[PDB]
Amino acid sequence: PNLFVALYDFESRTENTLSITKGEKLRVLNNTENGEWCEAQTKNGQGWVPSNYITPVN
């Protein structure tokens, strides 16, 4: 399973981060080795987001 929902708005100016909105659904493609960042996919594209900004959806 890899479906999540955003807990908060997140946006960074750094390249390769994805902007997400609270309540938006997303899928996680990859995980960093310390579990702190997730590579997310939404209708707005692909990019990294903090893992503590998302939570699973069954």
Residue numbers in the entry: 63 to 120
Sentences from the paper on this structure:
The Src homology 3 (SH3) domain is a ∼60-residue modular domain that consists of two antiparallel β-sheets orthogonally packed to form a single hydrophobic core. This domain is present in many proteins and regulates critical cellular pathways by recognizing polyproline-rich motifs (PRMs; Kurochkina & Guha, 2013). In previous work, the 3D-DS of the c-Src SH3 domain has been characterized and its dependence on experimental conditions has been described. This work explores the role of the hinge-loop composition by interchanging residues in the RT and n-Src loops between two SH3 domains: one being the c-Src SH3 domain, where 3D-DS has been described, and the other being the Abl SH3 domain, where 3D-DS has not been described to date.
Conversely, replacing the RT and n-Src loop residues in the Abl_Src chimeras with those from the c-Src SH3 domain results in destabilization under identical denaturing conditions. Notably, the Abl_Src-nSrc and Abl_Src-2 chimeras exhibit pronounced destabilization, highlighting a key role for the c-Src n-Src loop residues in determining the stability of these chimeric proteins. However, Src_Abl-nSrc shows an ordered distal loop in most of the molecules in the asymmetric unit and this chimera does not form the intertwined dimer. The same behaviour can be observed in the Abl_Src chimeras, where the distal loop shows low B factors. Indeed, even though the Abl_Src chimeras are less stable, this reduction in stability does not allow formation of the intertwined dimer.
